[PDB]
């Protein structure tokens, strides 16, 4: 019997037989809902995601998602460097002696004698071995002798760095370190632990970023999501931002599925938003080795080839490690299919 | 893109390969033709000869085995074909049925180079091509009257659906303590011959089957999971104008392509309700 | 008529005529009470005033006089240097921070930001412009920057060197000076203003002694007689000690005249004690241009020549400026008289 | 130290000079002799000749004028002598009195080279030696009967004490509105001729005078200050054995040397009481 004998083929092509029963007709049917991604293809080339960003922003989903695109909307204009700036910054002498006086007590007399007797060293010892720290410090703030000029600091902290937050901070600024702040100073004052990293490690980037990272993790893990991303954006750790976003993926596809969308519309829409959100973000930072990311990368490939847009598909194919066979195979297939 | 007059006798099958660039047809003239389509052009590349009767169907194999094409015909045999060094040649021949073979299909490339064959003799055959070349198949009695189609389920444990002229649709699964494919489920729902059956490759929890029949109706069979039964769902409440002859699923999107007798092709997709509509 | 026709002549000689009326007899009569000064002549040569000192000490007059000879009795044994020694000498770290804390207030936050932002300079400014001097000092006790490392000292004193004697002393030790102590610190703590001179001017003797002197004057003029002499003895200012002793002369000759002595015994005894006391003292210090001293020097000469001891007389004649005519004349007279 | 037989006639005066080393004597032989005494030796150096009568006294002048000696004699004249280039020679001669000159004495070197002369003619003469040499003296009538001695007061205003044979002692002071020495005080206290008077050179507030007499007593006259009168004080309550002939004060210590007629020399000093006793 006569019949179209229709079939689907790679690239979203439809093969059928003409009514005359003697001809073959290949085509690319218009599937309402499925459209090659132009914006992405065109922005990925003209590297101007103004429109793409403006699209996602104007049709964003949940509140959180809006921040990310806004984070990207402004990162778009101001630029990476200028962004991290506005994001990591912030909002009596005299005395004239008078009248008679006298060395009262043994303590005073002993220290005084030391001084005059040019024995600046002992003066401090005798001072510390009494609660005349203020003085001990004053004498030391006059000599050059470092070990002495330091035997007092370690003496101040010794009994104060624990009764005063500013004391504990000094203790750290003094001893050229951040480990303490970075790990115990309240996360709310992060923009500070932030300056203590750029301040202590201004010429050692590897360390500067190992610390900035160590902080981001702490922020994100203690309610500062938006901020931990800022720190990451400055540490050049796309991996951390990727990981966060991959964990937030499910719940995101769920809020879409409840929004009157078929299992496919949701899955489709989701993977697209994530891919466009990841692409634009990876375009401003200093950054594939994450399995799931790769896995989901491959996924977007197929949805793209099915749109017939083999060009945008290859672009993402390139960015994947040519070490992965699935990546290998699809690389070859897309080639012949288009070539 | 149209390639008018690819054959002078009526054509029964036209399939594009793994890259959707290499065409292939078959018809009553008892021959197959290889084409190369680009934009809106085309160039014949060869004409396969051998079948003693009208050729019913063809199926391209996965590239990882080479450039092969399989065909079956009213002549009750199946011929595999190869394009090595730039020329097509009949490598093997499968003929264990005593009546027209109506469908043939290459399993998923994971199973290796296996072929699913269905015939009007009521049997279905599973064939692999040994290390040396010859063939030692599996033959099962799968339908009374005659079998018109057979399709492989995607890979995980291996299953395939057949569609007979006994109006039934049937799922099959391979079993060890039998060394054969055993009948897992019988799905009743057509009042006339089942012409074709297509198992969707969709990788979602739910499995989709689409059977087409001489009764002018399409049924989408679905199974939520192993504990679920196969639920019947007519493609549309009203019967169609003519006999539905074929069913084909896209590779993504799970979109069904229905080929009617009024030589018309309708396209469908599923919606929030679980009911189909024009895509 | 016959008669001895006696006469007195220089050197205490008595010329008379023998009873035979034809001979002349010169002699040196024994005047009970008048005796050539051997001890002085013998000690002035053997420079061992142990006996002389032991003589004056065992027969001293008033209490004050006793101190001077004792001052000389001990100065005798111990020696000058060793004397000025025994006379001018004298009789918690840790802290471990704990728990949450936070930058409370604008002040703290501003200073903290400064620190981390490697801006050690501003931190201090913001500190001083608040009563966070303790801190301002702590920051400064960490840098090298002198002007800053000093902008705070001048800030401490500015409001404390007047409410604390030790503060005012520091102010001086700091600014390498003594003028303040030397002129206002209580005379009772002189052994201190003493160490502040030897301490600040250890390699500038002219100044060391100008100050030591400036102090001695203050002591002596404020009840510290015995002590001002010690300071003078170390400044090498025999002139000051001489002047004090010449003013104390009268009263001294008076206490002697009330002690059952003729106007002469008193005057005689007095000038002798003063001369022996001055000689022994000038023999241990680092030292004539004082009129009265000269004047009284000449006086002792005559009393000595009258004893016939022309040798001891010449000795003192030598020590006088051969610029003085009276000194000239007597130098000549003593010569012929003895030669 | 003794120089026996310095003269063969009785000797009346022996005086050592400013250095107390150069001796000089005089006696009836009408000659003076210069000696040089050391330890216990002596060597004559010359014999002065000229006086026509026994020589009574001699006085050495202050070295600042040269090496001079003055003498006076019963012959009623005074001769000055010099030792220039190594030899003594009569430079000048003073003779204005008409009777024995008994004393002569050089004023304090501050007044210049003045000479105090006293004679049995009752007068006293003051003589300086002009720029050219000659002499234009002061002559005053100072005692009845005769003047036996005269001594100069130390320097500040110039005063001198005389002692006559009228038993009186007398202080004299120079006056401008008279161009002469005027009688300032008369001290009564001896009952017989006054043989000598000595004004002590002591530089203490109090002035001391010592007069010796033919009455066998010595009197020490003292004056506390200008407003005080001259108080009389016998050297000792009991008279002496013989006539006192001379009085001499040391240069320091204010010790008096009394020369008696029993050719004995007593020495005295003052004590807390203001009374004299053997020194």
Distance separating alpha carbons of residues B7 and B14, to the nearest angstrom: 11
Of B17, B263, B271, which is closest to A3 when you measure between CB atoms?
B263
CB pairs under 8 A between C and D: 139
Q: What is the DSSP letter of D87?
A: E
Chain-centroid distance of CA D9 in Å reads 22
Which chains are adjacent to chain B, needing at least 3 Cβ pairs under 8 Å?
Answer: A
Kindly report the three-state secondary structure assignment for every residue of chain B: CEECCCCCCCEEEECCCCCCCEEEEEECCCEEEEEEECCCCEEEEEEEECCCCCEEEEEECCCECECEEEEEECCCEEEEEEEECCEEEEEEEECCCCCCEEEEEECCCCCCCCEEEEECCCEEEEECCCCCCCCCCEEEECCCCCEEEEEECCCCCCEEEEEECCCCEEEEEEEHHHCEEEEEEEECCCCCCEEEEEECCCCCCCEEEEEEECCCCEEEEEECCCCCCCECCECCCCCCCCCCCEEEECCCCCCEEEECCCCCEEEEEECCCCCEEEC
CB distance B23–A262 less than 8 Å?
no
**Chain D residues close to C6, C-beta within 8 Å:** 246, 248, 257-259, 265
Partner C, chain D 225-244, Cβ-Cβ below 8 Å: 243
What class is the C38-88+230-338 domain? Answer: mainly alpha
Fold match flag (C38-88+230-338 vs C106-203): yes
- Give the side-chain half-sphere CA count within 13 A for C277: 26
Test C184 with A102 for CB contact under 8 angstroms.
no
Q: Long-range contacts for B32-39 (Cβ within 8 Å, ≥24 apart)?
A: B32/B58, B32/B69, B32/B71, B32/B81, B33/B6, B33/B7, B34/B69, B34/B83, B34/B88, B35/A24, B35/B3, B35/B6, B37/A26, B37/B1, B37/B3, B39/B1
Domains and CATH numbers, chain B: 9-279 (2.130.10.10)
- Decide if C275 contacts C320 (C-beta within 8 A): no
| Nearest Cα residue to B125 out of B57, B76, B58 | B76
Query: Could you say which DSSP state residue D234 is in?
Result: B
Strands D218-223 and D246-249: unpaired
H or E stretch covering D198: strand D194-199
Complete DSSP assignment for C277-337 = HHHHHHTTS-----HHHHHHHHHHHHHHHTTT-HHHHHHHHHHS-TT-HHHHHHHHHHHHH
Interface test with D, best of C9, C32, C259, C325 (most D CBs within 10 A): C9
b/e burial code for range C220-245 (CB count within 10 A of at least 16 → b):
beeebeebbbbbbbbbebbebbbbeb
CA C16 to chain centre: 52
Cα(C249)–Cα(C38) distance, rounded to whole angstroms? 24
> Which of left, alpha, beta for B253 (phi over 0: left; psi -120 to 50: alpha)?
left
Task: Write the CA distances from A61 to A58, A252, C110, C248, integer angstroms.
Answer: 9, 9, 40, 110
Question: Dihedral through CA B261, CA B264, CA B269, CA B270, nearest 10?
Answer: -40
Please name every residue paired with D207 in a beta bridge, in sequence order, or none if there are none: D223
**Cα separation, C133 vs A134, whole angstroms:** 10
**Quick one: closest CA in D to C337, which residue?**
D19
DSSP class of C107:
H
**B252–chain A Cβ distance below 8 A for any pair:** yes
Q: What is the chain C residue with the closest CA to D262?
A: C3
Q: Are strands B265-270 and C7-9 parallel, antiparallel or unpaired?
A: unpaired
CA distance A242 to chain B (A): 25
Among D246, D263, D271, beta carbon nearest to C19: D263
List the single residue in B with minimal CA-CA distance to A6.
B259
Order the strands of the D22-27 sheet from edge to edge: D11-14, D22-27, D31-37, D42-49
The C-alpha R_g of chain A, in whole angstroms, comes to: 33
Q: Which chain A residues contact residue C162 at CB under 8 A?
A: 95-98
Chains C and D touch (3+ CB pairs under 8 A): yes
Q: What are phi and psi of D211, to 5 degrees?
A: -115, 145
Of A161, A184, A192, the CB nearest to C116: A192
Beta bridge partners of D140: D124
Residue in chain B nearest A8 by alpha carbon: B250
Between β-strands B55-60 and B68-73, what pairing exists: parallel, antiparallel or unpaired?
Answer: antiparallel
Give the class (CATH, top level) of C106-203: mainly alpha
Instruction: Mark whether D and A touch (3+ CB pairs within 8 Å).
Output: no
Question: Does the beta carbon of B15 lie under 8 angstroms from any beta carbon of chain A?
Answer: yes
SS3 D239: coil
Distance from CA of D192 to the nearest CA of C (A): 16
Interface list for B 180-219 with A (CB within 8 A) = 204
D205: DSSP letter? S
Residue D206 C-alpha, separation from nearest chain C C-alpha, in angstroms:
10
- The three-point CA angle D249-D250-D255 to 5° equals 75
**So what's the architecture of A1-30 in CATH?**
Single Sheet (2.20)
- Name the H helices within chain C: 38-46, 50-58, 63-78, 80-88, 106-116, 120-128, 133-140, 148-151, 153-157, 165-174, 179-184, 190-200, 205-220, 225-235, 238-247, 249-257, 263-282, 291-305, 310-319, 325-338
End-to-end CA distance of chain A: 36
Task: Give dist(CA C228, CA C206) in Å, integer.
Answer: 18
Q: D154 — contact with chain C (CB < 8 Å)?
A: no
Q: Can you tell me the distance from the alpha carbon of A154 to that of A176, in angstroms, rounded to the nearest whole number?
A: 14
- Kind and range of the H or E element at D220? strand D218-223
CB contact (8 A) between residue A141 and residue C158: no
Please tell me which chains touch A, using 3 or more CB pairs under 8 Å as the contact test. Answer: B, C
3-state SS track over chain A:
CCCCCCEEEHHHEEEEECCCCCCEEEECCCCCCCCCCHHHHHHHHHCCCHHHHHHHHHCCCCHHHHHHHHHHHHHHHHCHHHHHHHHHCCCCCCCCCCCCCCCCCHHHHHHHHHHHCCCHHHHHHHHHCCCCHHHHHHHHCCCCCCCHHHHCHHHHHCCCCCCCHHHHHHHHHHCCCCHHHHHHCCHHHHHHHHHHHHHHCCCCHHHHHHHHHHHHHHHHCCCCHHHHHHHHHHHCCHHHHHHHHHHCHHHHHHHHHCCCCCHHHHHHHHHHHHHHHHHHHHCCCCCCCCHHHHHHHHHHHHHHHCCCCHHHHHHHHHHCCCCCHHHHHHHHHHHHHHC
Cα distance from A125 to chain C (closest Cα, Å)? 11
Which positions in chain A touch B17 (Cβ < 8 Å)? 9
- CB atoms inside a 10 Å sphere around CB A312: 21
Nearest to A117 among C168, C184, C199 (CB): C199
Instruction: Tell me if C102 and A188 make a contact (CB, 8 A cut-off).
Output: yes
Residues A90, A92, A97: CA angle, nearest 5 degrees: 160
CB atoms within 10 A of CB B204: 11
Rounded Cα distance between B138 and B115, Å, is 11
Q: CA C68 to CA C252: how far, in whole Å?
A: 13
- Please report the number of interchain residue pairs, chain A to chain B, with beta-carbon separation below 8 angstroms: 139
Six-digit token string for B73: 């015909």
Determine, for residues A116 and C195 on separate chains, whether the beta-carbon distance falls below 8 Å: yes
How far apart, in whole angstroms, are the C-alpha atoms of residue B185 and residue B187?
6
Tell me how far CA of residue B257 lies from CA of A16, A208, A303, B10, B267, in angstroms: 10, 58, 18, 21, 5
Q: Which CATH number fits domain A107-229: 3.40.47.10, 3.10.20.740, 3.20.20.70, 1.25.40.980?
A: 1.25.40.980
Q: In what order do the strands lie in the sheet with B22-27?
A: B11-14, B22-27, B31-37, B42-49
Domain ranges for chain C, please list them.
Answer: 1-30, 38-88+230-338, 106-203
Q: Which uninterrupted H or E stretch holds D37? A: strand D31-37
Record: contact D204-C263, CB cut-off 8 A: yes
Tell me, in Å, the resolution of the deposited structure: 40.0
What are the structure tokens assigned to A214, written together? 């160590």
Contact criterion met (CB < 8 Å) for D15 and C9: yes
Q: List the end-to-end C-alpha distance of chain D, in Å, as a whole number.
A: 21
Q: How far is CA D111 from CA D65, D155, D159, D252, in A?
A: 12, 8, 11, 21
C-alpha distances (whole Å) from B209 to each of A15, B48, B206 are 21, 32, 10
Residue B223 sits at the chain A interface (C-beta within 8 Å): no
- By Cβ distance, the residue of A97, A171, A185 closest to C162 is A97
Nearest alpha carbon to residue B39 among A28, A315, A314: A28
Pairing type for strands B138-141 and A24-27 reads: unpaired
Question: If phi over 0 gives left and psi between -120 and 50 gives alpha, with beta otherwise, what is residue D253?
Answer: left
DSSP, res D151: E
Is B25–A24 a contact, with Cβ atoms under 8 angstroms apart? Answer: yes
Question: Does any CB of chain A come closer than 8 Å to the CB of residue B272?
Answer: yes
């Amino acid at each position: 019997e006569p019949s179209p004998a229709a079939h689907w083929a790679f690239g979203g092509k439809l093969v059928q037989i003409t009514p005359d029963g003697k001809g073959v007709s290949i085509t690319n049917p218009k599937i309402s809902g499925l459209e090659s991604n132009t914006t992405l293809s065109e922005a990925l080339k003209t590297k101007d995601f103004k429109p793409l960003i403006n699209q996602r922003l104007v049709k964003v989903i949940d509140d959180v998602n809006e921040e990310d695109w806004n984070l990207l909307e402004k990162l778009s204009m101001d630029g990476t460097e200028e962004f991290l700036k506005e994001a990591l910054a912030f909002d009596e002498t005299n005395f004239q002696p008078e009248g008679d006086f006298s060395l009262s007590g043994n303590i005073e007399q002993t220290i005084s004698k030391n001084l005059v007797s040019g024995n600046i060293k002992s003066a401090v010892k005798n001072s510390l071995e009494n609660d005349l720290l203020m003085e001990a410090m004053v004498i030391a703030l006059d000599s050059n002798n470092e070990r002495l000029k330091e035997s007092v600091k370690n003496a101040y902290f010794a009994k104060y760095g624990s009764k005063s937050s500013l004391s504990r901070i000094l203790y750290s600024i003094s001893k050229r370190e951040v480990d303490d702040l970075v790990e115990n100073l309240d996360v709310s004052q992060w923009k500070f632990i932030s300056k203590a990293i750029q301040n202590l490690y201004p010429n050692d980037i590897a360390q500067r970023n190992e610390m900035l990272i160590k902080l981001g993790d702490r922020l994100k893990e203690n309610g500062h999501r938006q901020d931990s991303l800022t720190l990451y954006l400055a540490a050049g750790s796309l991996d951390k931002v990727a990981s966060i976003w991959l964990s937030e993926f499910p719940d995101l596809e769920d809020k879409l599925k409840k929004d009157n969308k078929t299992i496919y519309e949701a899955h489709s829409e989701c993977l697209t938003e994530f891919i466009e959100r990841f692409t634009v973000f990876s375009n401003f930072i200093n950054g594939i080795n994450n399995e799931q990311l790769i896995a989901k990368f491959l996924e977007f490939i197929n949805l793209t080839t099915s749109t017939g847009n083999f060009e945008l598909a290859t672009e993402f194919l390139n960015s994947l490690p040519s070490d992965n066979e699935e990546v290998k195979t699809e690389k070859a297939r897309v080639l012949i299919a288009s070539g | 893109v149209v390639i008018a007059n690819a054959h002078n006798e009526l054509i029964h099958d036209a399939v594009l390969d793994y890259y959707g660039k290499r065409l292939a047809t078959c018809s009553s003239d008892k021959t197959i033709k290889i084409f190369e389509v680009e934009g809106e052009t085309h160039k014949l590349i060869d004409t396969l000869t051998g079948h003693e009767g009208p050729v019913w169907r063809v199926d391209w194999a996965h590239p990882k085995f080479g450039t092969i094409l399989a065909s079956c015909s009213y002549d009750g045999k199946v011929l595999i074909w190869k394009e090595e060094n730039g020329r097509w040649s009949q490598i093997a021949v499968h003929a264990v049925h005593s009546a027209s073979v109506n469908s043939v299909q290459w399993a998923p490339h994971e199973y290796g180079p296996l072929l699913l064959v269905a015939s009007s003799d009521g049997k279905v055959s599973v064939v692999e091509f040994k290390e040396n070349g010859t063939t030692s198949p599996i033959i099962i009695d799968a339908h009374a009257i005659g079998v018109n189609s057979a399709s492989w389920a995607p890979a995980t444990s291996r299953k395939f659906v057949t569609g007979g002229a006994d109006n039934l649709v049937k799922i099959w699964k391979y079993n060890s303590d039998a060394q054969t494919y055993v009948l897992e489920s019988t799905l009743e729902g057509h009042s006339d011959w089942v012409r074709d059956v297509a198992w969707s490759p969709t990788v979602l929890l739910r499995s989709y089957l689409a059977s087409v029949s001489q009764d002018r109706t399409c049924i989408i069979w679905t199974q939520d999971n192993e504990q679920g039964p196969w639920k019947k769902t007519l493609l549309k409440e009203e019967k169609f104008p003519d006999v539905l002859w074929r069913a084909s699923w896209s590779l993504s999107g799970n979109v069904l392509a229905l080929s009617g007798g009024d030589n018309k092709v309708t396209l469908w997709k599923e919606n929030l309700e679980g009911k189909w509509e024009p895509a």
